[PDB]
Design a protein around this ligand. Sequence first.
Ligand SMILES: Nc1nc2c(ncn2[C@@H]2O[C@H](COP(=O)(O)OP(=O)(O)NP(=O)(O)O)[C@@H](O)[C@H]2O)c(=O)[nH]1
Ligand SMILES: [Cl-]
Ligand SMILES: [Mg+2]
Length: 177
Amino acid sequence: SMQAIKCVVVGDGAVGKTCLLISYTTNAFPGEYIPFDNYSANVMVDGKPVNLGLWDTAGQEDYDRLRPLSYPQTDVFLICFSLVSPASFENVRAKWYPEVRHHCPHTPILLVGTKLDLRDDKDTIERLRDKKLAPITYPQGLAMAREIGSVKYLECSALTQRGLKTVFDEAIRAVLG
Ligand SMILES: Nc1nc2c(ncn2[C@@H]2O[C@H](COP(=O)(O)OP(=O)(O)NP(=O)(O)O)[C@@H](O)[C@H]2O)c(=O)[nH]1
Ligand SMILES: [Cl-]
Ligand SMILES: [Mg+2]
């Protein structure tokens, strides 16, 4: 049967984990309804179809004992932060990287910056400037990726779908080659 790949997506509340999965799998960004489900996608990689199982997770502290129950048999993790939330970025090193590695010392991690569409949005830049902050830049995201031993750093927008297929393609190749 098809090569199966278990991919688990983690990161702070509101970084866009669920939208990333729905936009990727259905080719449509959620409207009013945003639903921690498992999505099943099929991907053609080097001429063979692959069964990508995608596991959504809750980012909140209340699930700190329950969430890791989904981790066994994971083939690759995506650690997500919003490019327009520096707090979510800091939490990659402070929370997500240590949690994943505590349970899965060897599983490849891809770092994904989300909400790419908002990085040069004026209202967003101004909002962040008021708190003495700025959107996370590509060099900064890449530096965090190296620091956490990630195999790849990617940026995407679930809303426009820019970079979205590449995230999951690279996820698969980190497992398969
Ligand atoms: N502009 C923009 N907004 C986005 C994008 N992806 C998600 N959002 C918005 O960000 C918010 C959170 O998205 P969501 O997918 O629910 O995040 P989450 O990471 O699943 N949160 P949780 O841990 O609570 O379940 C929603 O308002 C959603 O519309 C994106 O690419 N661009
Ligand atoms: Cl890297
Ligand atoms: Mg969600």
